[PDB]
């Protein structure tokens, strides 16, 4: 199995409403584990998971310092962007970044990345070779040449291949019990009458972790392609997830349809029928 350490970072300007807001969020796989919020009463990096409470005080001292230096420099990036785009003054704009490493079960770095977006649109991104940049437009081309000239890709690569991979390992040790658990989905089917002698069958999966799952409906051994409604997988709020899938079927024929649930926490897929 693969794992990832990723940081997602947002600076949002608010001219005439004080300085930009700044947020950093760290995730191990997809679980949030640290957060820095410039708007908190006393802004500092904080643990977002009980297994993070165990780290040494120096952890928070260095990470809060990094976050504050990123906060200050992202204010500069917002002004720089306005300049590069020659945009009129007085609006809110956003700069976002994602940086992180994806590592296979053999410890190999599968993907290291650093991406930036301006106003929610791709701005610049480190290519998979960890040496060259893809710039989305002419503004980003200025950034690209500046970064080339400054050796920026080498510093990114050094971080992605080194500290990123090493700390991901550390975080997996610290949070193993929670991060790597599985909660199998509790599945059930509901039946709802629809005018015209039709019936909606909804197949629910609840209480599962991790979030990946597949739900299908079959009639006579084939999966119902279209005709099926499927909601985006959504957080229950307690660390687990939900999803459902429905199909509309002829009154009196419910029993020929079966729902199938595939999840890594099940020894084999579930099969349910009304």
């Amino acid at each position: 199995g693969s794992h990832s350490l990723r940081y997602f970072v947002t600076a949002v300007s608010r001219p005439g409403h004080g300085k930009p807001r700044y947020m950093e969020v760290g995730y191990v796989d997809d679980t949030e584990f640290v957060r820095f919020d410039s708007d908190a009463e006393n802004p500092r990096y904080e643990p977002r998971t009980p297994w993070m409470e165990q780290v040494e005080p120096e952890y928070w001292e260095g990470q809060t310092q990094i976050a504050k230096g990123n906060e200050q420099s992202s204010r500069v990036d917002l002004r720089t962007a306005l300049r590069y785009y020659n945009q009129s003054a007085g609006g809110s704009h956003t700069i976002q970044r994602m940086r992180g490493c994806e590592v296979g079960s053999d410890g190999r770095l599968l993907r290291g990345y650093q991406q930036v977006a301006y106003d929610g649109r791709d701005y610049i991104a480190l290519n998979e070779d960890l040496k060259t940049w893809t710039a989305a437009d002419m503004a980003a081309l200025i950034t690209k040449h500046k970064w080339e000239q400054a050796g920026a890709a080498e510093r990114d690569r050094a971080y992605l291949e080194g500290a990123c991979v090493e700390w991901l390992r550390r975080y997996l040790e610290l949070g193993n019990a929670t991060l790597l658990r599985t909660d199998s989905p509790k599945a059930h089917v509901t039946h709802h009458s629809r005018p015209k002698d039709k019936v909606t069958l909804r197949c629910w999966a609840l209480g599962f972790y991790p979030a990946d799952i597949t739900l299908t409906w079959q009639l006579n051994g084939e999966e119902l392609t279209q005709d099926m409604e499927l909601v985006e997988t959504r957080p229950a709020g307690d660390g687990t997830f939900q999803k459902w899938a429905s199909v509309v079927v002829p009154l009196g024929k419910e029993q020929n349809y079966t729902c199938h649930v595939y999840h890594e926490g099940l020894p084999e897929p579930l099969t349910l029928r009304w």
């Binding site: 760290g26 990094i66 976050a67 990123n70 500069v76 590069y84 700390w167």
Partner: peptide
């Protein structure tokens, strides 16, 4: 851990 981000 996070690191510094180079200015654009």
């Amino acid at each position: 851990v996070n690191d510094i981000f180079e200015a654009i």
